[PDB]
């Protein structure tokens with residue numbers, strides 16, 4: 001009958017009401033269970049997503065990401081990757097919204113912010129993969145790219161690993177300078193450090209950069225620690241990669257969405273047969289990751305709509321708890337179904 | 347650190363006010379004029395057809411489809427219509443078969459700038475498209491309009507065609523007796539005389555016909571192949587699933603056929619049934635060079651309409667212009683734009699009561 005809209009201010013209230021740590025953990029839990037269900041064949045990976053490339057001011061892409069729950073609802077995330085946004089407009093690079101449509105009737109039932117939600121579920125996905133593939137006594141996090149994702153990468157990982165410090169690099173000096181402030185709520189100290197030092201000293205690394213197509217790697221193939229786990233998070237355009245090939249070829253690599261990663265993720269650099277089990281399989285049967293915490297591992301993260309549906313559910317339950325949001329009659333639902341012009345006055 | 351951006355939302359009450367303030371006729375005429383100019387632009391090569399739209403089949407309660415329809419104007423904005431075809435809707439839920447919304451995103455930043463009802467808008471630009479094709483392909487003295495399917499689309503087909511042709515009568519059929527029986531009431535505001543008539547009579551008498559039905563896959567045709575007037579123009583409007591068609595093959599093969607979006611029509615329209623050599627020049631071509639419609643008025647013609655996002659963009663602009671002039675709609679901060687672009691957690695709670 002009406003659309004439930006949660007805006008920027010409701011999303012802020014959700015985070016306050018739940019707590020940043022608890023909210024992240026909720027999403028981590030829901031992702032874990034959902035992924036296991038996919039891994040058991042009980043739910044399906046989202047279909048491949050579509051997109052429109054944009055040249056100006058620098059190259060980006062704008063995408064639609066559907067996920068259907070047959071007989072309940074369709075989720076669609078509409079989201080932009082616009083890497084000039086912070087410097088040119090004071091806007092996040094990743095800018096989006098997430099909509100829910102009733103599957104039986106098509107009606108738009110809910111609409112909310114995609115920015116916070118994307119950051120949270122992306123951080124969560126790394127935590128999921130890192131609980132399986134990083135040493136549980138991991139103490140040093142490395143971060144290449146210290147923009148918006150870096151924050152929830154650090155946050156999420158600090159919740160599943162006993163992190164004591166983060167060594168961080170960004171090619172924009174102002175962005176690496178501000179990271180300690182943005183990270184300080186998590187209690188993990190932060191030290192700026194060049195890619196070679198991060199490689200050599202980190203136990204777990206997340207790369208989440210706006211690197212250009214064809215300009216990788218963002219982490220050099222120097223010595224790494226034997227047990228290093230890398231969450232490879234950066235991903236927008238085809239031809240965009242973050243890690244060096246020689247590193248990928250020696251790694252146990254798991255993808256979030258193998259078909260998508262082979263096209264848009266680090267797995268662009270590999271053939272399918274060289275991938276370990278996908279993330280959903282590992283979630284469904286964690287013992288299949290058994291010795292991999294102690295050897296070189298890569299989680300190839302690209303993002304997919306199921307993760308957004310799950311995260312949106314978490315938000316909606318919290319917002320329901322505290323009746324946040326407004327209700328807007330957006331759709332024209334004429335009482336006369338058959339009359340476009342039955343516009344409604346009582 | 348720019349001006350705080352929010353989403354301009356026009357809900358059902360706002361679209362209703364636009365119609366009331368501008369007037370029905372004037373509003374439809376505006377849409378026809380903007381579709382006309384835009385199609386000519388595509389026909390001159392100054393703009394491009396929308397890309398193929400996407401969609402998710404649904405089985406239950408009866409077979410249906412939910413689609414996303416993008417159109418991008420580079421460096422300007424992206425339009426996305428999200429829309430359901432759910433044909434059990436009216437008779438199982440009392441909802442419109444076609445249920446949708448139209449959203450606009452800034453092309454430079456990705457920001458969601460506007461969002462409105464898709465229901466009225468879809469109906470208006472779809473009637474408008476048929477008006478465009480019918481001005482080109484119907485006899486300009488056409489007096490008798492046929493309608494097969496008397497649901498939501500039928501209403502704007504009649505309305506739009508009444509503005510471009512001297513329509514005197516509408517002969518109308520629906521396989522659901524309740525839906526054809528209510529049609530006159532819904533059509534009354536056009537002034538055009540309505541009579542219920544079987545498909546064979548509609549075929550025999552009409553100068554122009556619109557088919558706009560929820561016929562199921564494999565269950566066509568909705569108009570039988572039995573003798574029409576030599577000059578008949580048909581706006582073939584029904585379209586959802588592959589395997590859904592409304593016209594007899596035989597008839598299509600006697601007609602000058604023009605599609606709105608050929609690549610799309612060849613897959614999802616009446617041209618599903620046809621090999622590509624049986625299509626004439628597309629609608630955009632005809633709009634850009636009407637002489638290419640020469641002589642087609644006096645013989646059998648078919649406009650194979652499927653709908654495409656460009657039409658929704660243009661219609662949405664007409665609506666936004668009228669809403670801006672009349673101060674309508676609300677402003678909602680939907681997207682989180684943190685004061686620090688690189689800090690997802692730089693959040694702003696509802697300010698405290700003072």
Ligand SMILES: NC(=O)c1ccc[n+]([C@@H]2O[C@H](COP(=O)([O-])OP(=O)(O)OC[C@H]3O[C@@H](n4cnc5c(N)ncnc54)[C@H](O)[C@@H]3O)[C@@H](O)[C@H]2O)c1
Pocket residue numbers: 081083086092093094118119122144145146147148149150169170171172175208209210211212217218232233234235236301302303304687688
């Ligand atoms: N895997 C997923 O699910 C997922 C989800 C969201 C975003 N992303 C992607 O993650 C990437 C980052 O997104 P974001 O929101 O943090 O954007 P952002 O602009 O806030 O952060 C990008 C940062 O990378 C830095 N950078 C660019 N090139 C670099 C290089 N060669 N070395 C080090 N730093 C470099 C920039 O200076 C900037 O600080 C994008 O590609 C985005 O599409 C992935």
Ligand SMILES: NC(=O)c1ccc[n+]([C@@H]2O[C@H](COP(=O)([O-])OP(=O)(O)OC[C@H]3O[C@@H](n4cnc5c(N)ncnc54)[C@H](O)[C@@H]3O)[C@@H](O)[C@H]2O)c1
Pocket residue numbers: 337338431433436442443444468469472494495496497498499500519520521522525558559560561562567568583584585586651652653654
């Ligand atoms: N081409 C476009 O741009 C465009 C735009 C919108 C909708 N559509 C399509 O137009 C069609 C109709 O949409 P609507 O909004 O009017 O749906 P509606 O449900 O409002 O009207 C459909 C009518 O068709 C009737 N019907 C079903 N089978 C029939 C038959 N064999 N003969 C006569 N009537 C029959 C139903 O009884 C119903 O009354 C759908 O296929 C829809 O997807 C096309």
Ligand SMILES: O=C(O)[C@@H]1CCCCN1
Pocket residue numbers: 063079080081118235236302303304
């Ligand atoms: O899953 C996501 O939200 C992002 C959007 C941008 C490119 C792909 N990864």
Ligand SMILES: O=C(O)[C@@H]1CCCCN1
Pocket residue numbers: 413429430431444468585586652653654
């Ligand atoms: O163009 C449209 O709006 C419709 C939507 C439903 C099926 C396809 N045609």
